[PDB]
């Protein structure tokens, strides 16, 4: 049976990308994290302190506590047929701001914009997203040229 070591099987997960070793870019450190911020976890091997366990690399949670160097996150971990919202303390280097929530936050603005707008105009403007509809009926112009013929090429042994 396998071992139960903490960093087991993380040969590539915690490795640095190619030609991206060395000192850590300082913009990661100067990045604010409020409470309730959606945050995705990605362990970095350069900093061995406060690394998340390998079962959270790639998961996304929300911040609930902010200390000097680390943040507390509430992540959902699936454990044999039940989900557990459990708390981890990970140091900033293994942390990114999730851009999954922002496209909703952006969409809220135009919804709040196009509501106060076109209200006094009265024009009812669609707000909900709709799936890609079946494309409309159109005309395809073949001005001049006529569609060139396609025929399967004959086989010829490559090797």
């Amino acid at each position: 049976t396998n071992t139960k070591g903490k960093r087991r099987g993380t040969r590539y997960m915690f490795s640095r990308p190619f030609r991206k070793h060395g000192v850590v870019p300082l913009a990661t450190y100067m990045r604010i994290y409020k409470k309730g911020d959606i945050v995705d976890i990605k362990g970095m091997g350069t900093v061995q302190k406060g690394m998340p366990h390998k079962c959270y690399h790639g998961k996304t949670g929300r911040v609930y506590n902010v200390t000097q160097h680390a943040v507390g996150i509430v992540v959902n971990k699936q454990v044999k047929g039940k989900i557990l919202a459990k708390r981890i303390n990970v140091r900033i280097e293994h942390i990114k701001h999730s851009k999954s929530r922002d496209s909703f936050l952006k969409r809220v603005k135009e919804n709040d914009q196009k509501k106060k707008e076109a209200k006094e105009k009265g024009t009812w403007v669609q707000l909900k997203r709709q799936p890609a509809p079946p494309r409309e009926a159109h005309f395809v112009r073949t001005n001049g040229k006529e569609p060139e013929l396609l025929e399967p090429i004959p086989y010829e042994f490559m090797a």
Binding site: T1, Y64, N65, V66, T67, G72, V74, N76, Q78, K80, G81, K82, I83, L84, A85, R87
Partner: protein, 104 residues
């Protein structure tokens, strides 16, 4: 007298009988695990919230009055819709009365 060592064969089916339910979401989540220095001060902010109560209701009374004088300073074919107007039970009563004189 060996035996099977380990398997997860039927497990995924067992897990989904009663569903894999996400943890119970709830607003006002607990404050266990928060930085004690931050929590200690946060409890002081609540301990003295009543100190500014008279300031609150006084600034709130004028704030409802502010908008009080504000709003008071301001304050597919016609054939089918014609029949739908007659066929309406309440607002068609005066409409389907010519019909009473129609057979007469």
């Amino acid at each position: 007298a060996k035996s099977k060592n380990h398997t997860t064969h039927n497990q995924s089916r067992k897990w989904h009988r009663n569903g894999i339910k996400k943890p119970r979401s709830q607003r006002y989540e607990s404050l266990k695990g928060v930085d004690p220095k931050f929590l200690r001060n946060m409890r002081f902010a609540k301990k003295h919230n009543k100190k500014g109560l008279k300031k609150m209701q006084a600034n709130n009374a004028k704030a409802m009055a502010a908008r009080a004088e504000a709003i008071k300073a301001l304050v597919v074919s016609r054939k089918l819709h014609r029949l739908a107007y007659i066929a309406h039970p309440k607002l068609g009563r005066r409409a389907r009365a010519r019909i009473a004189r129609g057979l007469r």
